[PDB]
Design a binder for these strands. Sequence first.
RNA 1: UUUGGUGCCCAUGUCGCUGUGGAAACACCUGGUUCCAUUUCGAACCCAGCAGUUAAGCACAGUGGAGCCGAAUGUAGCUGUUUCAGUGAGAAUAGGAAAGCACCAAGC
RNA 2: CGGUCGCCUCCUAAAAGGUAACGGAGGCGUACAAAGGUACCUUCAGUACGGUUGGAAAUCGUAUGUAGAGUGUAAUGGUGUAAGGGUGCUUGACUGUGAGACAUACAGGUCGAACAGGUGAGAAAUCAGGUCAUAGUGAUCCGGUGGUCCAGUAUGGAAUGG
RNA 3: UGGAGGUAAAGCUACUGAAUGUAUGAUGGCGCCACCUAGGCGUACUGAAUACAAUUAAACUCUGAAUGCCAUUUAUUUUA
Lengths: 179, 116, 46, 88, 50, 136
Amino acid sequence: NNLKAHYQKTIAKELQKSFAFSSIMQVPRLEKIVINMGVGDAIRDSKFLESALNELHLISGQKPVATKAKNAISTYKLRAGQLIGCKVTLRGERMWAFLEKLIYVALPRVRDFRGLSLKSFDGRGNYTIGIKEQIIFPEIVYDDIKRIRGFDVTLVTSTNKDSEALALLRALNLPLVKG
Amino acid sequence: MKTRTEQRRLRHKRIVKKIRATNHDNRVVLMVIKSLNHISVQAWDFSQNIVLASSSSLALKLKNGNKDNAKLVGQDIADKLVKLKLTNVVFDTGGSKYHGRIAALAEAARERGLNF
Amino acid sequence: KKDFHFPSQSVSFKCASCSNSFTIESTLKQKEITIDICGKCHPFYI
Amino acid sequence: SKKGVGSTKNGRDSHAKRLGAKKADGQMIRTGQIIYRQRGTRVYPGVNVGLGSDDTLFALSDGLVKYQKFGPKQGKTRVSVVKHKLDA
Amino acid sequence: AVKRSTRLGCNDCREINYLTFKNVKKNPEKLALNKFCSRCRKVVVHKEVK
Amino acid sequence: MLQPKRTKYRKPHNVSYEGKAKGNSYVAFGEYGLVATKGNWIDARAIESARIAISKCLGKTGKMWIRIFPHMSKTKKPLEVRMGSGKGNPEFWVAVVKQGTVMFEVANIPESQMIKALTRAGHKLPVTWKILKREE
RNA sequence: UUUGGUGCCCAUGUCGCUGUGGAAACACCUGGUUCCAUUUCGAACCCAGCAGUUAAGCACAGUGGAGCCGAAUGUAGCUGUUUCAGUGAGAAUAGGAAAGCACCAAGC
RNA sequence: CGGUCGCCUCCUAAAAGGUAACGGAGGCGUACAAAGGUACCUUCAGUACGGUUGGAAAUCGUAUGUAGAGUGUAAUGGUGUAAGGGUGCUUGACUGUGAGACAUACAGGUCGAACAGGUGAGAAAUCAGGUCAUAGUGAUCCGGUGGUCCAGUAUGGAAUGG
RNA sequence: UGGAGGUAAAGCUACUGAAUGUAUGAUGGCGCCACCUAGGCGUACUGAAUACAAUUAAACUCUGAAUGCCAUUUAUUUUA
Ligand SMILES: [Mg+2]
Ligand SMILES: [Mg+2]
Ligand SMILES: [Mg+2]
Ligand SMILES: [Mg+2]
Ligand SMILES: [Mg+2]
Ligand SMILES: [Mg+2]
Ligand SMILES: [Mg+2]
Ligand SMILES: [Mg+2]
Ligand SMILES: [Mg+2]
Ligand SMILES: [Mg+2]
Ligand SMILES: [Mg+2]
Ligand SMILES: [Mg+2]
Ligand SMILES: [Zn+2]
Ligand SMILES: [Zn+2]
């Protein structure tokens, strides 16, 4: 990606100067964006889960692996050995492609993207974005599951400090309130 | 969760435990350790806990990390073992999957008079 | 991994007001699909 | 008057398996003789000592048996058969 | 007692040479293993025999 | 009546009171204490009698601690029953007091009332009691 | 002697904190076109190369914080004979402790 | 009269083994073609933080945590790179045996090196004669079924036996 | 002299239960308000978790003997 090379040059220079980092790779580096569109309807409407996967596939270019619960609950109708939820973890070129596509196409189409930040870092440098609806994503046709759901896009970084993660986010211009 | 070297050490510990449990004929144990740059090999004896023979890319002075130089390393170590009059060996990796460079070293040693 | 039926092809995206033809890999029509609200067309971002 | 008496409900016990050490440390032993019968490995096997389908330790060669304490805080026991090693 | 045992017989000399166990309720399909045969002195397919 | 809320086993073997003193040997919460000179089984009923006695002869600001607790239960076969047919049912809870265990301690009221209070507590118990003080 | 690998050991070997280091090597790293691989991801495994790198890891010095180890005296239980001679714990404590023993390859 | 009658696990059982009572607690008369065999890879439960449906608790990411997780089961013992989880190929859940031992009144029970035949996994070393281990079982007689290099009451068969 | 063990004792921040006091305190009961649902300020009091000090156990053990047991070495004795 041309923006990937732009990321290289720009992130290196500003970050290096911003904290006098003694090495170019001391600057934070983003690793992997997990997407987890999971639903318990597979306990009853198994069909739905299948469609779920395809949409997830259609969004990232990686086929989603379906995850299984590690316990069993009667109230939730849960039982061990069943597949409830798919997770995809993008890396390399595809992860940066999805990140740019999200921030530039999907996110500003959000009904009311006022944003949320500073109050999202887990204290170790991660970040989770809770999407409310799937239809807003461009890689989705109107025909879909009878139920509509959101997403749990998350982020990782090489650093362990949440403040430096915020600094990388600002350098990348991820558009949130004051952050 | 870890770094590559720690996982390789863990797998190597598994292999060493198995070999020390089942090696009944007290064969010499040929542990080869592959790095990002080079790959070395040493023939220990778990009964005496010493090294009988050794060979390495540093010893052979090659820009290693290639399947080509693995054949040279295997030929040298097999020649040294033959000079030592030991031919019944057990071959274990440093914890890496037996393939590529590791497979070439083992086959070069086998084709030069070794019995394993 | 590879050998997929859903090919990630570099599709260009146009937008209103500001053209901003962003080229991104996706499994959609291979042409300049126009988006009505892009990043630059948002009161929050600018 | 007898007043009657209640009934007991637990009077069942199983046969006692004669487990424990069979060959003591320093005793000469031939191959195939039992050294330790146990339920679950209470004594680990060492050199020249095998295992069975009942976690029973038996010898694999002639020699003197020998116990050595090992493991974290010296809480694990290990048995071995040090061969005759007469070696002239 | 319950009877979960089953007999496995050769398919060359039609001799029964093995005694095994099988759950008719769980496993519905007949066993078609390959075991050693004393008569043929080789490995050969042994099938379930009534 | 002090009684354990639950027990794993209803009918345990009785616990001997013969021997020296394992724990609860020295006054460590108050500063005057009632030591025993004869190991015996004393039940929760005697504790309540002694505790009520101390509280009635206490004042408005005195404070007390009960060290021993009736952990172990004891059974009793019903009357007119011949030997056999299993162990009896648990009847009463007893605390095991060995020779040298401090049962009750008192503090925060003058010495004479405390000496008198420990005396009335010990007259309610079968063991031969003795007064002891806390080391400085 | 130092670095790297490995076996023996199984915290007086740990967890953590503060600094220093790279010549060769160890490592991150550069790419997935080849062999090979993902219950999906060249993340890992596997390739072929060392551009950048001392954040890591790794190696050294300090750090008694957590964890671990723990003397002598005395005591409880034991064996006898005494109503005293040995045997001697657990707990607690002063305190130690920033691993140790061998083999191999390189400049030494 | 009530209760029990066989086998397995713990305590009583007094730190080898063994040890009774109408002493104190429980289980078993199985399950698995994979929960067996092999090669490779991999490692808790819980909790903290951050996140649509989703809620105290479904799933995700990071960290912490030295077993409170799992090991089909009643307990005990064992086991956190294991004996737990996943994948590929398979059927050793083989044939004929078996030196030497454990424990035993007998009958029976338990472990097993090693040999020959032909296989499975694996590059090979090696492993596989059912499962992490201990309960899941009933003698003799009688008759029935399959195979068979034995007998066939003068001889050839058959009947009837072995 | 070597070894196996987990009893006596002791300990419960080394687990499983039982369990005392002090301090910080989840929690509820109890109120008084506002609000019909999100709640708030004190609680005669109940009491999670943590820290300090102290306890109990055949079926509790981070520990832990002596005696006894097995084998071997030396001396002596008996043909069992
Ligand atoms: Mg028993
Ligand atoms: Mg550094
Ligand atoms: Mg009757
Ligand atoms: Mg015993
Ligand atoms: Mg005894
Ligand atoms: Mg169990
Ligand atoms: Mg398998
Ligand atoms: Mg298994
Ligand atoms: Mg009859
Ligand atoms: Mg005839
Ligand atoms: Mg005791
Ligand atoms: Mg406790
Ligand atoms: Zn625009
Ligand atoms: Zn046949």
